[PDB]
Design a binder for this molecule. Structure first.
Ligand SMILES: O[C@@H]1CO[C@@H]2C[C@H]1Nc1ccccc12
Length: 164
């Protein structure tokens, strides 16, 4: 069974609500497991307390750099980077959960949730899940972004974890 995990997100300390994500461990077990474990914090580090640092309306919301908080950092539960597992899942529309990277085989912890079909990323970013509920919360996050990616409020993952 695929994990169900959640992100509780605030904007300047004000709750926006909860995003619930299905992780496709049945297709990309290593990538799903990394994200699941970073939600629970069970390795001693993870997403709790970190930010959505790059948010671009009509594109995507990017988070997961819990070390440098600016797109340069993050790390996986395996090491500083891990290979692209596969590209079987595609960026088919809004709600897709996919790995940010810095080129081939540079997955760490940064990730993005799409607010549009980002099919030009197929074959280059590992898709590993989708939004089950809370896409309205993703839209609220999106509303505090801008074309440069700079956010107009501090968007924080106040809490995260696993539901099943
Ligand atoms: O080691 C890799 C590559 O450098 C950082 C940290 C980690 N993942 C990642 C993903 C997107 C952007 C930058 C990075």
């Amino acid at each position: 069974g695929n994990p169900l995990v959640y992100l509780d997100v605030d904007a300047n300390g004000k709750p926006l609500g909860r995003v619930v994500l299905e992780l496709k461990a049945d297709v990309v077990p290593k990538t799903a497991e990394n994200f699941r474990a970073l939600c629970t914090g069970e390795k001693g580090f993870g997403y709790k307390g970190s930010t959505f640092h790059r948010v671009i309306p009509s594109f995507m919301c990017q988070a997961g750099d819990f070390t440098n908080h600016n797109g340069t950092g993050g790390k996986s539960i395996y090491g500083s980077r891990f290979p692209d597992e596969n590209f079987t899942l595609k960026h088919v529309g809004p709600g897709v959960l996919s790995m940010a990277n810095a080129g081939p085989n540079t997955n760490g912890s940064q990730f993005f949730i799409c607010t549009i079909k980002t099919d030009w990323l197929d074959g280059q970013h590992v898709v590993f899940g989708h939004v089950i509920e809370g896409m309205d919360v993703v839209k609220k996050i999106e509303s505090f972004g801008s074309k440069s990616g700079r956010t107009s409020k501090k968007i924080v993952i106040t809490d995260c974890g696993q539901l099943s």
